[PDB]
Symmetry: C3
Subunit: 136 residues, 3 copies
Protein backbone atom coordinates (compact mmCIF):
# COMPACT_ATOMS: atom_id res chain seq x y z
CA UNK A 1 0.00 0.00 0.00
CA UNK A 2 0.89 3.69 0.11
CA UNK A 3 0.82 6.64 2.52
CA UNK A 4 -0.05 10.34 2.59
CA UNK A 5 1.62 12.58 5.20
CA UNK A 6 -0.81 14.94 6.97
CA UNK A 7 -0.20 17.76 9.50
CA UNK A 8 -2.95 18.78 11.92
CA UNK A 9 -2.38 22.52 12.04
CA UNK A 10 -5.45 22.53 14.31
CA UNK A 11 -4.59 19.86 16.84
CA UNK A 12 -8.09 19.90 18.36
CA UNK A 13 -9.78 18.50 15.23
CA UNK A 14 -9.89 14.77 14.60
CA UNK A 15 -7.36 13.25 12.18
CA UNK A 16 -8.93 12.63 8.77
CA UNK A 17 -9.00 8.95 7.79
CA UNK A 18 -10.23 6.65 5.02
CA UNK A 19 -13.38 5.12 6.55
CA UNK A 20 -13.39 2.03 4.31
CA UNK A 21 -10.58 0.55 2.29
CA UNK A 22 -12.29 1.13 -1.07
CA UNK A 23 -13.42 4.72 -0.35
CA UNK A 24 -12.01 7.07 -3.01
CA UNK A 25 -12.25 10.06 -0.70
CA UNK A 26 -11.26 11.07 2.84
CA UNK A 27 -13.53 13.53 4.63
CA UNK A 28 -12.08 16.87 5.74
CA UNK A 29 -13.49 18.88 8.63
CA UNK A 30 -14.26 22.57 9.21
CA UNK A 31 -11.89 24.40 11.59
CA UNK A 32 -14.58 27.11 11.83
CA UNK A 33 -18.13 27.76 13.02
CA UNK A 34 -19.79 29.66 10.16
CA UNK A 35 -23.24 30.32 8.72
CA UNK A 36 -23.38 30.61 4.95
CA UNK A 37 -26.37 32.65 3.81
CA UNK A 38 -28.27 31.72 0.65
CA UNK A 39 -26.18 32.31 -2.46
CA UNK A 40 -23.14 33.42 -0.46
CA UNK A 41 -19.66 31.90 -0.33
CA UNK A 42 -16.85 31.77 2.14
CA UNK A 43 -13.35 30.41 2.37
CA UNK A 44 -13.08 27.95 5.30
CA UNK A 45 -9.95 26.35 6.72
CA UNK A 46 -9.79 22.58 7.28
CA UNK A 47 -6.99 22.80 9.81
CA UNK A 48 -4.81 20.32 7.89
CA UNK A 49 -1.98 20.34 5.38
CA UNK A 50 -0.87 17.44 3.17
CA UNK A 51 2.22 16.40 1.21
CA UNK A 52 0.85 15.23 -2.15
CA UNK A 53 3.48 13.01 -3.80
CA UNK A 54 5.51 14.02 -6.84
CA UNK A 55 3.56 13.15 -9.97
CA UNK A 56 0.19 13.18 -8.24
CA UNK A 57 -2.57 15.67 -7.52
CA UNK A 58 -4.93 16.17 -4.57
CA UNK A 59 -8.52 16.77 -5.57
CA UNK A 60 -10.99 18.41 -3.20
CA UNK A 61 -14.63 17.49 -3.96
CA UNK A 62 -17.96 18.35 -2.42
CA UNK A 63 -19.68 15.53 -0.58
CA UNK A 64 -22.89 13.76 -1.54
CA UNK A 65 -25.80 13.11 0.82
CA UNK A 66 -27.23 15.57 3.30
CA UNK A 67 -24.57 18.23 2.53
CA UNK A 68 -25.41 18.23 -1.17
CA UNK A 69 -29.17 18.04 -0.39
CA UNK A 70 -28.96 21.35 1.63
CA UNK A 71 -27.05 22.92 -1.30
CA UNK A 72 -23.48 22.93 -0.02
CA UNK A 73 -20.85 22.92 -2.77
CA UNK A 74 -17.42 24.28 -3.67
CA UNK A 75 -17.06 27.34 -5.94
CA UNK A 76 -13.98 26.08 -7.78
CA UNK A 77 -14.80 22.35 -7.66
CA UNK A 78 -12.78 20.27 -7.98
CA UNK A 79 -10.19 22.05 -5.88
CA UNK A 80 -6.62 21.02 -6.70
CA UNK A 81 -3.64 20.57 -4.38
CA UNK A 82 -0.21 20.37 -6.05
CA UNK A 83 2.82 18.44 -4.77
CA UNK A 84 4.29 21.92 -4.13
CA UNK A 85 1.66 23.04 -1.68
CA UNK A 86 2.16 22.37 2.02
CA UNK A 87 -0.02 25.17 3.45
CA UNK A 88 -3.41 24.74 5.04
CA UNK A 89 -6.11 23.23 2.78
CA UNK A 90 -8.91 25.80 2.56
CA UNK A 91 -12.26 25.23 0.86
CA UNK A 92 -14.28 27.91 -0.99
CA UNK A 93 -17.76 26.83 0.13
CA UNK A 94 -20.97 28.11 -1.45
CA UNK A 95 -24.60 27.81 -0.41
CA UNK A 96 -26.52 27.04 -3.60
CA UNK A 97 -29.89 27.17 -1.85
CA UNK A 98 -31.96 30.28 -2.57
CA UNK A 99 -33.64 30.59 0.87
CA UNK A 100 -32.16 28.51 3.64
CA UNK A 101 -28.80 29.30 5.35
CA UNK A 102 -26.30 26.46 5.93
CA UNK A 103 -24.98 26.23 9.49
CA UNK A 104 -21.55 24.67 9.76
CA UNK A 105 -20.11 23.70 13.10
CA UNK A 106 -16.41 23.31 13.81
CA UNK A 107 -15.66 19.61 13.24
CA UNK A 108 -18.34 19.19 10.56
CA UNK A 109 -17.44 17.37 7.36
CA UNK A 110 -17.24 19.94 4.55
CA UNK A 111 -15.33 18.26 1.65
CA UNK A 112 -13.49 15.12 0.64
CA UNK A 113 -9.93 14.63 -0.52
CA UNK A 114 -9.02 12.28 -3.37
CA UNK A 115 -5.49 11.54 -4.55
CA UNK A 116 -4.66 10.57 -8.17
CA UNK A 117 -1.78 10.25 -10.48
CA UNK A 118 -1.49 13.23 -12.85
CA UNK A 119 0.27 13.64 -16.22
CA UNK A 120 2.77 16.54 -16.41
CA UNK A 121 3.36 17.11 -20.12
CA UNK A 122 5.42 20.00 -21.45
CA UNK A 123 3.13 21.97 -23.77
CA UNK A 124 4.73 22.11 -27.22
CA UNK A 125 3.32 24.52 -29.79
CA UNK A 126 2.52 23.21 -33.28
CA UNK A 127 1.06 25.14 -36.23
CA UNK A 128 -1.54 22.39 -36.81
CA UNK A 129 -2.10 18.77 -35.77
CA UNK A 130 -0.53 17.48 -39.02
CA UNK A 131 2.54 16.32 -37.03
CA UNK A 132 4.12 12.96 -36.23
CA UNK A 133 3.53 11.49 -32.72
CA UNK A 134 -0.17 12.36 -32.41
CA UNK A 135 -3.23 10.16 -31.93
CA UNK A 136 -5.00 8.90 -35.08
Amino acid sequence: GSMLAIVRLDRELPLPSRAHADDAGVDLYSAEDVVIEPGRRTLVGTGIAVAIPSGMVGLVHPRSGLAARVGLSIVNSPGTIDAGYRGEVKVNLINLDSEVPIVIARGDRIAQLLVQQVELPELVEVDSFDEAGLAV
Copy 2:
Protein backbone atom coordinates in the same frame (compact mmCIF):
# COMPACT_ATOMS: atom_id res chain seq x y z
CA GLY B 1 -9.33 -3.80 -23.26
CA SER B 2 -11.40 -3.72 -20.08
CA MET B 3 -15.03 -3.96 -18.95
CA LEU B 4 -17.46 -2.33 -16.52
CA ALA B 5 -20.45 -4.35 -15.27
CA ILE B 6 -23.74 -2.41 -15.33
CA VAL B 7 -27.24 -3.33 -14.07
CA ARG B 8 -30.32 -1.72 -15.62
CA LEU B 9 -32.50 -1.35 -12.53
CA ASP B 10 -34.94 0.35 -14.93
CA ARG B 11 -35.14 -2.13 -17.77
CA GLU B 12 -37.10 0.28 -19.99
CA LEU B 13 -34.21 2.75 -20.38
CA PRO B 14 -31.54 2.19 -23.01
CA LEU B 15 -28.21 0.65 -21.94
CA PRO B 16 -25.53 3.33 -21.54
CA SER B 17 -22.61 2.90 -23.94
CA ARG B 18 -19.37 4.59 -24.99
CA ALA B 19 -20.33 6.30 -28.26
CA HIS B 20 -16.77 6.51 -29.61
CA ALA B 21 -13.71 4.56 -28.58
CA ASP B 22 -11.82 7.63 -27.34
CA ASP B 23 -14.73 9.19 -25.41
CA ALA B 24 -13.75 9.68 -21.75
CA GLY B 25 -17.37 9.63 -20.62
CA VAL B 26 -20.50 7.50 -21.04
CA ASP B 27 -23.84 9.32 -20.97
CA LEU B 28 -26.35 8.40 -18.27
CA TYR B 29 -30.10 8.88 -18.68
CA SER B 30 -32.89 10.21 -16.45
CA ALA B 31 -35.31 7.58 -15.09
CA GLU B 32 -37.68 10.48 -14.30
CA ASP B 33 -39.75 13.23 -15.93
CA VAL B 34 -39.00 16.36 -13.88
CA VAL B 35 -39.01 20.14 -14.23
CA ILE B 36 -36.29 21.93 -12.34
CA GLU B 37 -37.25 25.53 -11.57
CA PRO B 38 -34.64 28.31 -11.66
CA GLY B 39 -32.12 27.96 -8.85
CA ARG B 40 -33.68 24.72 -7.57
CA ARG B 41 -32.14 21.27 -7.27
CA THR B 42 -33.37 17.74 -7.27
CA LEU B 43 -31.99 14.26 -6.86
CA VAL B 44 -32.76 12.17 -9.98
CA GLY B 45 -32.25 8.45 -10.49
CA THR B 46 -30.42 7.15 -13.58
CA GLY B 47 -31.92 3.68 -13.33
CA ILE B 48 -28.50 2.00 -13.39
CA ALA B 49 -25.94 0.61 -10.97
CA VAL B 50 -22.27 -0.13 -11.69
CA ALA B 51 -19.47 -2.23 -10.22
CA ILE B 52 -16.46 0.11 -10.18
CA PRO B 53 -13.30 -2.02 -9.96
CA SER B 54 -11.09 -2.24 -6.88
CA GLY B 55 -8.56 0.58 -6.98
CA MET B 56 -10.65 2.79 -9.24
CA VAL B 57 -13.28 5.48 -8.88
CA GLY B 58 -16.37 6.40 -10.90
CA LEU B 59 -16.73 10.11 -11.57
CA VAL B 60 -20.07 11.64 -12.49
CA HIS B 61 -19.72 14.91 -14.45
CA PRO B 62 -22.14 17.37 -15.97
CA ARG B 63 -22.29 17.38 -19.76
CA SER B 64 -21.18 20.15 -22.09
CA GLY B 65 -23.27 21.52 -24.97
CA LEU B 66 -26.95 22.31 -24.85
CA ALA B 67 -27.35 20.98 -21.28
CA ALA B 68 -24.65 23.29 -19.94
CA ARG B 69 -25.96 26.18 -22.11
CA VAL B 70 -29.43 25.95 -20.41
CA GLY B 71 -27.67 25.92 -17.00
CA LEU B 72 -27.91 22.26 -16.00
CA SER B 73 -25.19 21.15 -13.59
CA ILE B 74 -24.55 18.88 -10.60
CA VAL B 75 -24.52 20.28 -7.05
CA ASN B 76 -21.68 18.09 -5.80
CA SER B 77 -19.75 17.83 -9.08
CA PRO B 78 -17.83 15.70 -9.65
CA GLY B 79 -19.96 12.98 -8.10
CA THR B 80 -17.94 9.97 -6.93
CA ILE B 81 -18.84 6.28 -7.04
CA ASP B 82 -16.69 3.95 -4.90
CA ALA B 83 -15.89 0.30 -5.63
CA GLY B 84 -18.12 -0.40 -2.60
CA TYR B 85 -21.26 1.12 -4.03
CA ARG B 86 -23.63 -1.06 -6.03
CA GLY B 87 -26.87 0.91 -5.50
CA GLU B 88 -28.58 3.08 -8.06
CA VAL B 89 -26.52 6.03 -9.37
CA LYS B 90 -28.46 9.18 -8.53
CA VAL B 91 -27.53 12.69 -9.67
CA ASN B 92 -28.10 15.89 -7.65
CA LEU B 93 -29.08 18.18 -10.54
CA ILE B 94 -29.30 21.96 -10.25
CA ASN B 95 -30.73 24.60 -12.57
CA LEU B 96 -28.20 27.45 -12.53
CA ASP B 97 -30.36 29.67 -14.73
CA SER B 98 -32.09 32.54 -12.92
CA GLU B 99 -35.31 32.60 -15.01
CA VAL B 100 -35.92 29.62 -17.24
CA PRO B 101 -36.99 26.16 -15.93
CA ILE B 102 -35.23 23.04 -17.27
CA VAL B 103 -37.58 20.32 -18.51
CA ILE B 104 -36.13 16.83 -18.32
CA ALA B 105 -37.84 13.92 -19.96
CA ARG B 106 -37.37 10.30 -18.95
CA GLY B 107 -34.58 8.98 -21.20
CA ASP B 108 -32.82 12.36 -21.48
CA ARG B 109 -29.07 12.49 -21.01
CA ILE B 110 -28.35 14.15 -17.65
CA ALA B 111 -24.70 13.31 -16.76
CA GLN B 112 -21.66 11.38 -17.89
CA LEU B 113 -19.70 8.65 -16.16
CA LEU B 114 -15.90 8.50 -16.25
CA VAL B 115 -13.78 5.75 -14.71
CA GLN B 116 -10.21 6.34 -13.43
CA GLN B 117 -7.60 4.74 -11.34
CA VAL B 118 -7.46 6.23 -7.82
CA GLU B 119 -4.70 6.23 -5.18
CA LEU B 120 -5.73 4.85 -1.76
CA PRO B 121 -3.05 6.06 0.66
CA GLU B 122 -3.27 5.54 4.40
CA LEU B 123 -3.12 9.00 5.97
CA VAL B 124 -0.18 9.12 8.38
CA GLU B 125 0.10 12.04 10.79
CA VAL B 126 3.41 13.90 11.04
CA ASP B 127 4.26 16.91 13.23
CA SER B 128 5.77 18.75 10.24
CA PHE B 129 6.98 17.90 6.73
CA ASP B 130 10.61 17.60 7.93
CA GLU B 131 10.41 13.80 7.48
CA ALA B 132 12.11 11.26 5.22
CA GLY B 133 10.11 9.92 2.21
CA LEU B 134 8.56 13.22 1.10
CA ALA B 135 8.83 15.14 -2.17
CA VAL B 136 11.63 17.71 -2.47
Copy 3:
Protein backbone atom coordinates in the same frame (compact mmCIF):
# COMPACT_ATOMS: atom_id res chain seq x y z
CA GLY C 1 9.00 13.33 -19.60
CA SER C 2 6.03 13.79 -21.92
CA MET C 3 4.51 16.40 -24.23
CA LEU C 4 1.13 17.88 -25.17
CA ALA C 5 0.71 19.45 -28.63
CA ILE C 6 -1.10 22.82 -28.56
CA VAL C 7 -2.30 25.10 -31.40
CA ARG C 8 -2.71 28.84 -30.81
CA LEU C 9 -5.79 29.51 -32.91
CA ASP C 10 -5.46 33.07 -31.57
CA ARG C 11 -1.83 33.85 -32.26
CA GLU C 12 -1.95 37.10 -30.26
CA LEU C 13 -2.47 35.35 -26.90
CA PRO C 14 0.47 34.01 -24.93
CA LEU C 15 1.27 30.29 -25.14
CA PRO C 16 -0.04 28.44 -22.08
CA SER C 17 2.71 26.82 -20.01
CA ARG C 18 3.23 24.85 -16.79
CA ALA C 19 4.56 27.51 -14.39
CA HIS C 20 6.25 25.04 -12.04
CA ALA C 21 7.26 21.46 -12.66
CA ASP C 22 4.89 20.03 -10.03
CA ASP C 23 1.84 22.12 -11.01
CA ALA C 24 -1.08 19.83 -11.88
CA GLY C 25 -2.71 22.48 -14.04
CA VAL C 26 -1.81 24.87 -16.87
CA ASP C 27 -3.65 28.19 -16.98
CA LEU C 28 -5.75 29.00 -20.05
CA TYR C 29 -6.52 32.55 -21.14
CA SER C 30 -9.64 34.36 -22.38
CA ALA C 31 -9.67 35.24 -26.10
CA GLU C 32 -12.51 37.67 -25.28
CA ASP C 33 -13.32 40.84 -23.34
CA VAL C 34 -16.59 40.09 -21.54
CA VAL C 35 -18.55 41.17 -18.48
CA ILE C 36 -20.49 38.43 -16.76
CA GLU C 37 -23.42 39.82 -14.78
CA PRO C 38 -24.42 38.27 -11.44
CA GLY C 39 -25.86 34.79 -11.89
CA ARG C 40 -25.28 34.81 -15.66
CA ARG C 41 -23.15 32.49 -17.77
CA THR C 42 -21.34 32.70 -21.04
CA LEU C 43 -19.31 30.47 -23.29
CA VAL C 44 -15.81 31.97 -23.80
CA GLY C 45 -13.11 30.82 -26.20
CA THR C 46 -9.54 30.23 -24.97
CA GLY C 47 -8.01 30.58 -28.41
CA ILE C 48 -6.24 27.22 -28.17
CA ALA C 49 -6.75 23.62 -29.22
CA VAL C 50 -4.96 20.55 -27.83
CA ALA C 51 -4.27 16.96 -28.89
CA ILE C 52 -5.02 14.90 -25.77
CA PRO C 53 -3.25 11.53 -26.11
CA SER C 54 -5.04 8.25 -26.73
CA GLY C 55 -6.09 6.77 -23.39
CA MET C 56 -6.08 10.10 -21.58
CA VAL C 57 -8.52 12.89 -20.83
CA GLY C 58 -8.16 16.67 -20.56
CA LEU C 59 -9.90 18.18 -17.56
CA VAL C 60 -10.81 21.86 -17.43
CA HIS C 61 -11.13 23.19 -13.86
CA PRO C 62 -11.92 26.55 -12.34
CA ARG C 63 -9.02 28.30 -10.65
CA SER C 64 -8.60 29.01 -6.95
CA GLY C 65 -7.61 32.39 -5.50
CA LEU C 66 -8.96 35.74 -6.58
CA ALA C 67 -11.05 34.23 -9.43
CA ALA C 68 -12.87 31.88 -7.07
CA ARG C 69 -13.17 34.65 -4.43
CA VAL C 70 -15.11 36.89 -6.93
CA GLY C 71 -17.36 33.90 -7.74
CA LEU C 72 -16.03 32.78 -11.11
CA SER C 73 -16.67 29.11 -11.88
CA ILE C 74 -17.52 26.72 -14.72
CA VAL C 75 -21.10 25.52 -15.26
CA ASN C 76 -20.16 21.98 -16.27
CA SER C 77 -17.04 21.64 -14.10
CA PRO C 78 -14.93 19.69 -14.63
CA GLY C 79 -14.99 20.21 -18.38
CA THR C 80 -13.69 17.22 -20.33
CA ILE C 81 -11.62 17.15 -23.53
CA ASP C 82 -11.45 13.79 -25.35
CA ALA C 83 -8.55 12.51 -27.47
CA GLY C 84 -10.98 12.99 -30.39
CA TYR C 85 -11.44 16.70 -29.95
CA ARG C 86 -9.11 19.08 -31.76
CA GLY C 87 -11.38 22.16 -31.92
CA GLU C 88 -11.04 25.28 -29.83
CA VAL C 89 -11.31 24.76 -26.05
CA LYS C 90 -14.24 26.87 -24.87
CA VAL C 91 -15.23 27.40 -21.23
CA ASN C 92 -18.81 27.82 -19.95
CA LEU C 93 -18.12 30.47 -17.29
CA ILE C 94 -20.63 31.46 -14.61
CA ASN C 95 -20.69 34.34 -12.14
CA LEU C 96 -21.85 32.82 -8.85
CA ASP C 97 -21.92 36.19 -7.09
CA SER C 98 -25.39 37.62 -6.47
CA GLU C 99 -24.50 41.34 -6.89
CA VAL C 100 -21.14 42.08 -8.43
CA PRO C 101 -20.35 41.61 -12.17
CA ILE C 102 -17.08 39.88 -13.17
CA VAL C 103 -15.01 41.79 -15.73
CA ILE C 104 -12.80 39.59 -17.86
CA ALA C 105 -10.17 41.08 -20.10
CA ARG C 106 -8.72 39.34 -23.15
CA GLY C 107 -5.59 37.55 -21.89
CA ASP C 108 -6.98 36.97 -18.39
CA ARG C 109 -6.62 33.53 -16.84
CA ILE C 110 -10.06 31.88 -16.79
CA ALA C 111 -9.47 28.11 -16.23
CA GLN C 112 -6.79 25.48 -15.85
CA LEU C 113 -6.11 22.37 -17.88
CA LEU C 114 -5.13 19.06 -16.27
CA VAL C 115 -4.24 15.89 -18.16
CA GLN C 116 -4.82 12.38 -16.72
CA GLN C 117 -4.95 8.82 -17.76
CA VAL C 118 -8.53 7.56 -18.17
CA GLU C 119 -9.99 4.03 -18.16
CA LEU C 120 -12.06 3.12 -21.26
CA PRO C 121 -14.08 0.06 -20.25
CA GLU C 122 -16.73 -1.47 -22.47
CA LEU C 123 -19.96 -1.43 -20.47
CA VAL C 124 -21.27 -4.99 -20.19
CA GLU C 125 -24.81 -5.55 -18.93
CA VAL C 126 -25.38 -8.08 -16.14
CA ASP C 127 -28.68 -9.01 -14.47
CA SER C 128 -27.11 -8.60 -11.00
CA PHE C 129 -23.62 -8.36 -9.50
CA ASP C 130 -23.59 -12.11 -8.67
CA GLU C 131 -21.04 -12.67 -11.48
CA ALA C 132 -17.42 -13.81 -11.64
CA GLY C 133 -14.72 -11.12 -12.18
CA LEU C 134 -16.14 -8.48 -9.81
CA ALA C 135 -14.67 -6.85 -6.71
CA VAL C 136 -15.35 -8.53 -3.35
